[PDB]
Design an enzyme around this catalytic site. Structure first.
Site, PDB file in Angstrom:
ATOM      1  N   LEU A 136       0.824  -1.205   0.000  1.00 46.95           N
ATOM      2  CA  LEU A 136       0.000   0.000   0.000  1.00 46.95           C
ATOM      3  C   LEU A 136       0.864   1.264   0.000  1.00 46.95           C
ATOM      4  O   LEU A 136       1.995   1.243   0.483  1.00 46.95           O
ATOM      5  CB  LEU A 136      -0.919   0.000   1.218  1.00 46.95           C
ATOM      6  CG  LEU A 136      -1.830  -1.234   1.337  1.00 46.95           C
ATOM      7  CD1 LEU A 136      -2.764  -1.027   2.506  1.00 46.95           C
ATOM      8  CD2 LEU A 136      -2.609  -1.405   0.054  1.00 46.95           C
ATOM      9  N   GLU A 173      -9.118   0.936   9.265  1.00 46.08           N
ATOM     10  CA  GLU A 173      -9.502   0.847   7.857  1.00 46.08           C
ATOM     11  C   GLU A 173      -9.362  -0.616   7.436  1.00 46.08           C
ATOM     12  O   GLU A 173     -10.200  -1.142   6.686  1.00 46.08           O
ATOM     13  CB  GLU A 173      -8.618   1.767   6.990  1.00 46.08           C
ATOM     14  CG  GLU A 173      -9.317   2.314   5.738  1.00 46.08           C
ATOM     15  CD  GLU A 173      -9.388   1.267   4.627  1.00 46.08           C
ATOM     16  OE1 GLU A 173     -10.450   1.212   3.985  1.00 46.08           O
ATOM     17  OE2 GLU A 173      -8.389   0.515   4.405  1.00 46.08           O
TER      18      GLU A 173
HETATM   19  N1  LIG Z   1      -5.328   0.027  -1.787  1.00 44.76           N
HETATM   20  C1  LIG Z   1      -6.128  -0.977  -2.170  1.00 44.76           C
HETATM   21  O1  LIG Z   1      -7.473  -1.087  -1.893  1.00 44.76           O
HETATM   22  C2  LIG Z   1      -5.532  -2.099  -2.942  1.00 44.76           C
HETATM   23  C3  LIG Z   1      -4.192  -2.007  -3.263  1.00 44.76           C
HETATM   24  N2  LIG Z   1      -3.571  -3.067  -3.858  1.00 44.76           N
HETATM   25  C4  LIG Z   1      -2.154  -2.924  -4.265  1.00 44.76           C
HETATM   26  O2  LIG Z   1      -2.150  -2.971  -5.677  1.00 44.76           O
HETATM   27  C5  LIG Z   1      -0.962  -3.594  -6.138  1.00 44.76           C
HETATM   28  C6  LIG Z   1      -1.331  -4.868  -6.887  1.00 44.76           C
HETATM   29  O3  LIG Z   1      -2.304  -4.585  -7.850  1.00 44.76           O
HETATM   30  P1  LIG Z   1      -1.993  -4.653  -9.407  1.00 44.76           P
HETATM   31  O4  LIG Z   1      -0.560  -4.354  -9.592  1.00 44.76           O
HETATM   32  O5  LIG Z   1      -2.977  -3.894 -10.172  1.00 44.76           O
HETATM   33  O6  LIG Z   1      -2.070  -6.203  -9.783  1.00 44.76           O
HETATM   34  P2  LIG Z   1      -3.131  -7.360  -9.658  1.00 44.76           P
HETATM   35  O7  LIG Z   1      -3.363  -7.868  -8.295  1.00 44.76           O
HETATM   36  O8  LIG Z   1      -4.314  -6.992 -10.432  1.00 44.76           O
HETATM   37  O9  LIG Z   1      -2.331  -8.538 -10.432  1.00 44.76           O
HETATM   38  C7  LIG Z   1      -2.172  -8.442 -11.834  1.00 44.76           C
HETATM   39  C8  LIG Z   1      -2.059  -9.863 -12.394  1.00 44.76           C
HETATM   40  O10 LIG Z   1      -3.196 -10.616 -11.991  1.00 44.76           O
HETATM   41  C9  LIG Z   1      -3.785 -11.269 -13.110  1.00 44.76           C
HETATM   42  N3  LIG Z   1      -5.021 -10.562 -13.521  1.00 44.76           N
HETATM   43  C10 LIG Z   1      -5.299  -9.236 -13.291  1.00 44.76           C
HETATM   44  N4  LIG Z   1      -6.508  -8.934 -13.807  1.00 44.76           N
HETATM   45  C11 LIG Z   1      -7.034 -10.049 -14.345  1.00 44.76           C
HETATM   46  C12 LIG Z   1      -8.251 -10.274 -14.983  1.00 44.76           C
HETATM   47  N5  LIG Z   1      -9.135  -9.289 -15.133  1.00 44.76           N
HETATM   48  N6  LIG Z   1      -8.534 -11.528 -15.463  1.00 44.76           N
HETATM   49  C13 LIG Z   1      -7.608 -12.542 -15.296  1.00 44.76           C
HETATM   50  N7  LIG Z   1      -6.398 -12.320 -14.651  1.00 44.76           N
HETATM   51  C14 LIG Z   1      -6.112 -11.083 -14.182  1.00 44.76           C
HETATM   52  C15 LIG Z   1      -2.733 -11.224 -14.199  1.00 44.76           C
HETATM   53  O11 LIG Z   1      -1.824 -12.227 -13.839  1.00 44.76           O
HETATM   54  P3  LIG Z   1      -1.001 -13.099 -14.934  1.00 44.76           P
HETATM   55  O12 LIG Z   1       0.166 -12.252 -15.367  1.00 44.76           O
HETATM   56  O13 LIG Z   1      -0.564 -14.300 -14.177  1.00 44.76           O
HETATM   57  O14 LIG Z   1      -1.955 -13.366 -16.062  1.00 44.76           O
HETATM   58  C16 LIG Z   1      -2.037  -9.909 -13.915  1.00 44.76           C
HETATM   59  O15 LIG Z   1      -0.701  -9.916 -14.358  1.00 44.76           O
HETATM   60  C17 LIG Z   1      -0.161  -3.897  -4.892  1.00 44.76           C
HETATM   61  O16 LIG Z   1       0.693  -2.802  -4.646  1.00 44.76           O
HETATM   62  C18 LIG Z   1      -1.215  -4.013  -3.806  1.00 44.76           C
HETATM   63  O17 LIG Z   1      -0.680  -3.762  -2.536  1.00 44.76           O
HETATM   64  C19 LIG Z   1      -4.287  -4.188  -4.147  1.00 44.76           C
HETATM   65  C20 LIG Z   1      -5.622  -4.319  -3.802  1.00 44.76           C
HETATM   66  C21 LIG Z   1      -6.267  -3.254  -3.177  1.00 44.76           C
HETATM   67  C1  LIG Z   2      -7.051  -3.141   3.759  1.00 47.02           C
HETATM   68  C2  LIG Z   2      -6.622  -2.133   2.718  1.00 47.02           C
HETATM   69  C3  LIG Z   2      -7.725  -2.117   1.924  1.00 47.02           C
HETATM   70  N1  LIG Z   2      -8.730  -1.293   2.210  1.00 47.02           N
HETATM   71  C4  LIG Z   2      -9.841  -1.304   1.458  1.00 47.02           C
HETATM   72  N2  LIG Z   2     -10.831  -0.468   1.758  1.00 47.02           N
HETATM   73  N3  LIG Z   2      -9.955  -2.137   0.419  1.00 47.02           N
HETATM   74  C5  LIG Z   2      -8.956  -2.982   0.104  1.00 47.02           C
HETATM   75  N4  LIG Z   2      -8.997  -3.851  -0.908  1.00 47.02           N
HETATM   76  C6  LIG Z   2      -7.813  -3.010   0.870  1.00 47.02           C
HETATM   77  C7  LIG Z   2      -6.732  -3.915   0.573  1.00 47.02           C
HETATM   78  C8  LIG Z   2      -5.868  -4.624   0.366  1.00 47.02           C
HETATM   79  C9  LIG Z   2      -4.740  -5.528   0.148  1.00 47.02           C
HETATM   80  C10 LIG Z   2      -4.439  -6.149   1.386  1.00 47.02           C
HETATM   81  C11 LIG Z   2      -3.158  -5.929   1.910  1.00 47.02           C
HETATM   82  C12 LIG Z   2      -2.821  -6.521   3.119  1.00 47.02           C
HETATM   83  O1  LIG Z   2      -1.646  -6.438   3.818  1.00 47.02           O
HETATM   84  C13 LIG Z   2      -0.565  -5.684   3.317  1.00 47.02           C
HETATM   85  C14 LIG Z   2      -3.764  -7.259   3.757  1.00 47.02           C
HETATM   86  C15 LIG Z   2      -5.028  -7.544   3.323  1.00 47.02           C
HETATM   87  C16 LIG Z   2      -5.864  -8.332   4.167  1.00 47.02           C
HETATM   88  C17 LIG Z   2      -7.176  -8.485   3.775  1.00 47.02           C
HETATM   89  C18 LIG Z   2      -8.119  -9.206   4.502  1.00 47.02           C
HETATM   90  C19 LIG Z   2      -7.777  -9.840   5.671  1.00 47.02           C
HETATM   91  C20 LIG Z   2      -6.466  -9.735   6.091  1.00 47.02           C
HETATM   92  C21 LIG Z   2      -6.137 -10.387   7.271  1.00 47.02           C
HETATM   93  N5  LIG Z   2      -4.851 -10.343   7.800  1.00 47.02           N
HETATM   94  C22 LIG Z   2      -3.887  -9.618   7.119  1.00 47.02           C
HETATM   95  C23 LIG Z   2      -4.232  -8.988   5.941  1.00 47.02           C
HETATM   96  C24 LIG Z   2      -5.507  -9.005   5.372  1.00 47.02           C
HETATM   97  C25 LIG Z   2      -5.389  -6.931   2.102  1.00 47.02           C
END
Ligand SMILES: NC(=O)C1=CN([C@@H]2O[C@H](COP(=O)(O)OP(=O)(O)OC[C@H]3O[C@@H](n4cnc5c(N)ncnc54)[C@H](OP(=O)(O)O)[C@@H]3O)[C@@H](O)[C@H]2O)C=CC1
Ligand SMILES: CCc1nc(N)nc(N)c1C#CCc1cc(OC)cc(-c2cccc3cnccc23)c1
Ligand SMILES: [Cl-]
Ligand SMILES: [Mg+2]
Ligand SMILES: [Mg+2]
Length: 186
Positions: free
Chosen positions: A22, A30
């Site tokens: 993140l 959160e």
């Molecule tokens: N702040 C937040 O709420 C969130 C933040 N994050 C952050 O985001 C980053 C990771 O996200 P991001 O980089 O976008 O990558 P993703 O988690 O989306 O991973 C991308 C890979 O997943 C597979 N993939 C993605 N989309 C699809 C699809 N639509 N259908 C089939 N396969 C798919 C592909 O893998 P392959 O190459 O194997 O085909 C692709 O290379 C991290 O830094 C994480 O910490 C993640 C979730 C939430």
């Molecule tokens: C939690 C940050 C966040 N907030 C919101 N509103 N939506 C999201 N999708 C996310 C996210 C994310 C990725 C993520 C990162 C992570 O650690 C770096 C942990 C989780 C996570 C997700 C759910 C349960 C978990 C339980 N133990 C540890 C981690 C858990 C999930």
């Protein structure tokens, strides 16, 4: 499946990720919100399903994989089977939702939660039918390398309040944020 949910936390500059983690320091409450939303099933005997991209999977701290109390599904076009600890693997969002109808998940899944990353959110947000987007607005810019697709207000409406979701600005570690809920119906 009759409804999908997305959940995400986003900085002012549309950031969700930086270097496989993140962009901001850990915000305990959160995270507990994310846990509460994704884990809470309305049906005894059923769990929610979480769908995520591969890098998101690996961004979860290993000790915490798979996410407890939930069925964990990973999306990849390259893997031949689920990452160690993950319950299911699909090559597409479509394939993932169809799996819930199949005999193994039949009657085991309650709600479906899309938990990133960027491409998964983009596809889910454009999927037909009812969808709620739970978006935490982190009210600060943070350096990011992964971003959230902007929300098209032609399709989504920002709900003014919402049951089970706090409306007022929150603050943890001096970082202000607000929980929002958006909804489209068809
Ligand atoms: N702040 C937040 O709420 C969130 C933040 N994050 C952050 O985001 C980053 C990771 O996200 P991001 O980089 O976008 O990558 P993703 O988690 O989306 O991973 C991308 C890979 O997943 C597979 N993939 C993605 N989309 C699809 C699809 N639509 N259908 C089939 N396969 C798919 C592909 O893998 P392959 O190459 O194997 O085909 C692709 O290379 C991290 O830094 C994480 O910490 C993640 C979730 C939430
Ligand atoms: C939690 C940050 C966040 N907030 C919101 N509103 N939506 C999201 N999708 C996310 C996210 C994310 C990725 C993520 C990162 C992570 O650690 C770096 C942990 C989780 C996570 C997700 C759910 C349960 C978990 C339980 N133990 C540890 C981690 C858990 C999930
Ligand atoms: Cl709010
Ligand atoms: Mg866990
Ligand atoms: Mg940063």
């Amino acid at each position: 499946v009759g409804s999908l949910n997305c959940i995400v936390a986003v900085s002012q500059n549309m950031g969700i990720g930086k270097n496989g983690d993140l962009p901001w320091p850990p915000l305990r409450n959160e995270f507990r919100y994310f846990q509460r939303m994704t884990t809470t099933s309305s049906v005894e005997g059923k769990q929610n399903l979480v769908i995520m991209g591969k890098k998101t999977w690996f961004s979860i701290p290993e000790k915490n994989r798979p996410l407890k109390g939930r069925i964990n599904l990973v999306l990849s076009r390259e893997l031949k089977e689920p990452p160690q600890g993950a319950h299911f693997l699909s090559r597409s969002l479509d394939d993932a939702l169809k799996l819930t109808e199949q005999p193994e998940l039949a009657n085991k899944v309650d709600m479906v939660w899309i938990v990133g990353g960027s491409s998964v959110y983009k596809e889910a947000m454009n999927h037909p039918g009812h969808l709620k987007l739970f978006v935490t607005r982190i009210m600060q810019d943070f350096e990011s390398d992964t971003f959230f697709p902007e929300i098209d207000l032609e399709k989504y409406k920002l709900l003014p309040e919402y049951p089970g979701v706090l409306s007022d600005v929150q603050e943890e570690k001096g970082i202000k944020y607000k929980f929002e809920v958006y909804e489209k119906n068809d």
